[PDB]
Amino acid sequence: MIQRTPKIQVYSRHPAENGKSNFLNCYVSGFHPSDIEVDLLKNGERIEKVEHSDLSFSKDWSFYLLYYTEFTPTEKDEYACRVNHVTLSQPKIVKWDRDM
Amino acid sequence: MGSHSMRYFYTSVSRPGRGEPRFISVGYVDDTQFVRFDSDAASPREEPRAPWIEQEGPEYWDRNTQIYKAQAQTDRESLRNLRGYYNQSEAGSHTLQSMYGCDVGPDGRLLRGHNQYAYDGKDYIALNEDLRSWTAADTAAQITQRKWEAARVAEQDRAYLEGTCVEWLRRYLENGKDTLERADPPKTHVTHHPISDHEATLRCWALGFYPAEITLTWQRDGEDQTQDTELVETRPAGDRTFQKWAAVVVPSGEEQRYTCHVQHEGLPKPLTLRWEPS
Amino acid sequence: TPQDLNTML
């Protein structure tokens, strides 16, 4: 069967300002089949309070989901999202780059 | 356009050994989700996902919940039938997706309807633009087509798309007018990121816009830089709006030859931006 | 509002 691997973007809702509350987003899209596991990470540890959008899909039938959590960025703290899907031979980690 | 759309998106996924197939539905007007249903919920019910739909009375939610429960059952029979049409094992997980709905113009008149299906991520069958005939992707889908022709299924689908779908879309647009009929233009800026002594990245940002449709292009000396521009997919911010950027790598000292062009239905006129060093 | 009375594939 033909599968499609997820595209992953990690970013904030609002422009990041150290010490100001925001939301950290991990947008996973373009994937098929729909089963996927996503964790958001703070300094490599799973953030517990993560919500996600309801499963939908694009015109090309590929699925997309937004995973998100409140965060207060700082100079030192590192954020990432880690994705596993049947198309990946190991989980993929994408680090948050405030410029991207 | 001035146009609007309503769409329902259904996903059924089998999971042999782990129960019956899960059915999920979501409904959208334009880029705004407004309802969901999930058969794996503790008490499956259609649920509101936008403020303007909360005013629908209990009969609405009860009717719709019954429709999705019946649909989940129909999709389970469809998945069994499809496995047979493809000579597939009962051991594998498979996906049936469906998308349908209508597009209307500013005056509320139907522009077109849609009703189509995919199996394992591949187009399977679609109602043609005439709302009368089908296009089948392969000999399995031709079975479905023959069954739906015999039953005159397209007639029911036409009636839904021309009647119910347009009438309810028009109601939603009226009730949600403050948001569904409001375009929020992008907030734009250009950033500069040195790569090396002899090149830098110029990144054109669009933030805070609705709906999601946008065009961001870079030009060099007025010529579009399609092959040399990195675009990211438009992405949701989580507050209804969307974000996008486009980047190009430029020779040091040549920044002023590059312009970013932004088109969005919230803008009276397209924007031209350049890097503004301070 | 969703469509009622759909048929199996």
Author numbering:
A (entry chain B): 0 to 99
B (entry chain A): 0 to 277
C (entry chain C): 1 to 9
Task: Please give me the paper's original passages concerning this structure.
The HLAI residues that are polymorphic are mainly those forming the peptide-binding groove, which contains six binding pockets (A to F) that define the size and chemical characteristics of the specific peptide repertoire that can be accommodated by each HLAI molecule. Cognate T-cell receptors (TCRs) expressed on CD8+ T-cells detect pathogen-derived peptides presented by HLAI molecules on the surface of infected cells. In this study we focus on two HIV-1-specific epitopes and their presentation by 4 different members of the HLA-B7 superfamily, HLA-B*07:02, HLA-B*42:01, HLA-B*42:02 and HLA-B*81:01. We show that single polymorphisms between different alleles of the HLA-B7 superfamily can induce a conformational switch in peptide conformation that is associated with differential HLAI-specific escape mutation and immune control.
For example, the dominant HIV-1-specific epitope restricted by two closely-related HLAI molecules within the B7 superfamily, HLA-B*42:01 and HLA-B*81:01, is the same peptide, Gag180–188 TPQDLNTML (TL9-p24). The escape mutation selected in each case differs, with variation most commonly arising at Gag-182 (position-3 in the epitope) in HLA-B*42:01-positive subjects, and at Gag-186 (position-7) in HLA-B*81:01-positive subjects. To explore this notion, we first solved the atomic structures of HLA-B*07:02, HLA-B*42:01 and HLA-B*81:01 with TL9-p24. Although peptide positions 1–4 and 8–9 were in similar orientations in both HLA-B*07:02-TL9, HLA-B*42:01-TL9 and HLA-B*81:01-TL9 structures, residues 5–7 in the HLA-B*81:01-TL9 structure, which differs in the peptide-presentation platform by just 4 and 3 residues compared to HLA-B*07:02 and HLA-B*42:01, respectively, were flipped into the opposite orientation. This ‘conformational switch’ resulted in Leu5 and Thr7 acting as secondary anchor residues in HLA-B*81:01-TL9, as opposed to being solvent exposed in HLA-B*07:02-TL9 and HLA-B*42:01-TL9 complexes. In contrast, the same residue served as a secondary anchor residue in HLA-B*07:02-TL9 and HLA-B*42:01-TL9. HLA-B*07:02 and HLA-B*42:01 have Trp at position 147, whereas HLA-B*81:01 has Leu147. Trp147, in HLA-B*07:02 and HLA-B*42:01, made three van der Waals (VdW) contacts with Thr7 and Met8 in the peptide, compared to just one VdW contact between Leu147 in HLA-B*81:01 and Met8, contributing to the respective peptide conformations. The smaller side chain of Leu156 in HLA-B*81:01 compared to the longer Arg156 in HLA-B*07:02 and Asp156 in HLA-B*42:01, enabled peptide residues Leu5 and Thr7 to form interactions stabilizing Asn6 in the flipped orientation in the HLA-B*81:01 structure. Tyr9 in HLA-B*07:02, HLA-B*42:01 made direct contacts with the primary N-terminal anchor residue (Pro2) in the TL9-p24 peptide.
